[PDB]
Amino acid sequence: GLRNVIYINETHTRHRGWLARRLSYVLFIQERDVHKGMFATNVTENVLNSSRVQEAIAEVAAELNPQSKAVNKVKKKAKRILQEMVATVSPAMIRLTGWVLLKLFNSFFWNIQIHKGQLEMVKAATETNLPLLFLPVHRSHIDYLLLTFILFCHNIKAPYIASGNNLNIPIFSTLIHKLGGFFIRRRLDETPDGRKDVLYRALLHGHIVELLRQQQFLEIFLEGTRSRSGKTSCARAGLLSVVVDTLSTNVIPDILIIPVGISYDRIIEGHYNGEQLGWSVARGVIRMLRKNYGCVRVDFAQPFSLKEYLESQSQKPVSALLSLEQALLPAILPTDESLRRRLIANLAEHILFTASKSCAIMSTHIVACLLLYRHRQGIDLSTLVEDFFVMKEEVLARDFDLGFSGNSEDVVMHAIQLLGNCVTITHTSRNDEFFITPSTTVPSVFELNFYSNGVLHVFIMEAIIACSLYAVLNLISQEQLVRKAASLCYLLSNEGTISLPCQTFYQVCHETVGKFIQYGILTVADCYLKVSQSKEHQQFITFLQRLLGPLLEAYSSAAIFVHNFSGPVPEPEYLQKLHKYLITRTERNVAVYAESATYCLVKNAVKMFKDIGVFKETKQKRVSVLELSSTFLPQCNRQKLLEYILSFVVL
Ligand SMILES: CC(C)(COP(=O)(O)OP(=O)(O)OC[C@H]1O[C@@H](n2cnc3c(N)ncnc32)[C@H](O)[C@@H]1OP(=O)(O)O)[C@@H](O)C(=O)NCCC(=O)NCCS
Ligand SMILES: CCCCCCCCCCCCCCCC(=O)OC[C@@H](O)COP(=O)(O)O
Asked: For the modification Phosphoserine, which residues carry it?
């Protein structure tokens, strides 16, 4: 029950015949319904006529005086900001781009899958007179080309995209402006001379207020950048404040929010090893686009009402105040605007979770997951083909989408040829069957790990309970397992979203222990559970244990570096000589999983220690210098902090 948006023969057009086939596409572009009338107009004028904006202008001028006829200057400046900000969509441009993208996608992709039922909802959300808001998860640059192209090819008007100021350059800007992309500043700060450019912020508020008030569609990537790790990073609540404020003020009745999940079998950009490790370009871009990449699946979550969601928050009698340190450390070592911050901050996480949990699991995702953790030593095809069937069922049985179908053999054989850089395909003695080992080198592994992290979010919970199960043992008391698991969540907090922000970890772990008894891995003898001593269950427990190896090893070997920490140092200088150590631990062959040396997990560990408050952040001259906290001034605390993390990791 799917749809391939790129698959366009004459059957997708009205006119038919030899000629009508030969020019199939050009007709399909002609038949699309996009006119100038259904786009917001008089935007600059309406934003410059705003009573908030003119008052914001009125006071910024007032400061500059010894009558006050300098208003001309600030007003003339205020205009120029909107002149570089606002977008101006041209149906002519959109069609002609859509045509090109329909050629190019059909060149360097195999297909782009859409579940009709998910879009038939969006076409019901469209035909109610409300402004929609599309919140995808940033992974590759192609994300912002797809989201629009998918809608354009179902007779839906292109959304106005919130774009980084980087792209604002001559020619390339005036193209983007005509394709809906409106440019916004980074940090919204002219200079540290001024506190806040009240004018710019008021104009930015006004623009979005106006663009929503005219019932147009908005596209915001809540992840400031695309993910280097290959999993959803920390959500930014920058613009969601601007969009919620619009509702808070009562200038528009309601907004619909649509989480989107775009999964790639192979991202055009490829591995991020170049960053994670720490003429000739244009040649590289030719070398880039001449390669083929795999399948794509874009998954739209159910549109929900922000108005109702914001009411639903006011039904909660008490909010979550517990600190990451106050959760963990006491178990290891014997308001007015702050509520408003948390309120909008949680929404962003709730969205990214919903989006990330829509993303379809790919073939590469499943192959990498097996190759890294299930085997590593490397296996002959037949065993991997039989496993690829077994894993596929494990994913479907947990209610997740697959971005592949057909013969397991062929779906794996396709997926190998994408991982051809990491994977080595050889011939074994007295066999017609071919052998498959992955790379365990410094640079190659990161590519396998990156694509492997695609599946991590399906098993992330069961893995925490699987690690905690091993932890508690060194006839389990259920309370202790939940209590122990609950911290391993607070510890791996920064690494990624584990569950919905609206419920506590205790409950999530209780439910996931509740799942293990339903599967029948744990059974009843306060409650006393026993682990099923069955080959299949044990190998699954050890797979789930192994799966979190890199994510614990890095956090362990991070604390091994803290053991000897000399004086206060700037963080950007520290992170490099912490990241050096983890590379040096592969270089010497001390670190087990070479995955751990990735730059992403280093930032997570330091932010985790900064959340725990081992390093007291005392930022100066616009950089974070790390002060070794009074609690962790002695050695015996850091010793226990090291001993603790070691309990979860298998030796
Ligand atoms: C413009 C943008 C950069 C703003 O984020 P930022 O400036 O980096 O983040 P800050 O926390 O410094 O934002 C400052 C303001 O945001 C608002 N804000 C940020 N987090 C907030 C939260 N949790 N609750 C309420 N308001 C919040 C406040 O009004 C805050 O005011 P302040 O300056 O007095 O603190 C925005 O782009 C963003 O972060 N999110 C969208 C990402 C994006 O579209 N990037 C382009 C690539 S497609
Ligand atoms: C049918 C035709 C479809 C029309 C397609 C038009 C698409 C318009 C694109 C608008 C401009 C892009 C949107 C903003 C995205 C953006 O700003 O990406 C850059 C950052 O996130 C990532 O930065 P980094 O990872 O640090 O390089």
From this structure: 280
Phi/psi at 133 (5° precision): -135, 110
Question: Are the CB atoms for 39 and 216 separated by under 8 Å?
Answer: yes
Distance CA 379, CA 547 (A): 18
Q: Write the burial class of residue 194 (CB in 10 Å: 0-12 exposed, 13-18 middle, 19+ buried).
A: exposed
Mutating to test ligand 1, I would choose from 236, 244, 351 the residue with most ligand atoms within 8 A of its C-beta, which is: 236
How far apart CA 149 and CA 164 sit, in angstroms, is 20
Distances (CA, A) of 231 to 239, 451, 454, 600: 22, 9, 7, 11
* Site residues for ligand 2, CB cut-off 6 Å: 94, 97-98, 101, 138, 144-145, 148-149, 152, 158, 161, 163-164, 167, 176, 179-181, 221, 225-226
Enumerate the H helices of 39-130 as residue ranges.
43-48, 51-62, 71-85, 91-108, 116-126
Same domain membership, residue 604 and residue 626 = yes
Q: How far is the CA of 222 from the centre of ligand 1 (A)?
A: 10
| Residue at 335 is within a domain | no
Q: Where are the alpha helices (DSSP H) in 524-565?
A: 535-547, 549-562
Which residues form ligand 1's pocket by a CB distance below 6 Å? 162-164, 184, 186-188, 220-221, 224, 236-239, 241, 341, 344-345
Q: How many residues does the chain have?
A: 651
Please tell me the total count of domains within the chain.
Answer: 5
Experimental method, per PDB record: cryo-EM
Pair 263, 453: CB distance under 8 Å:
no
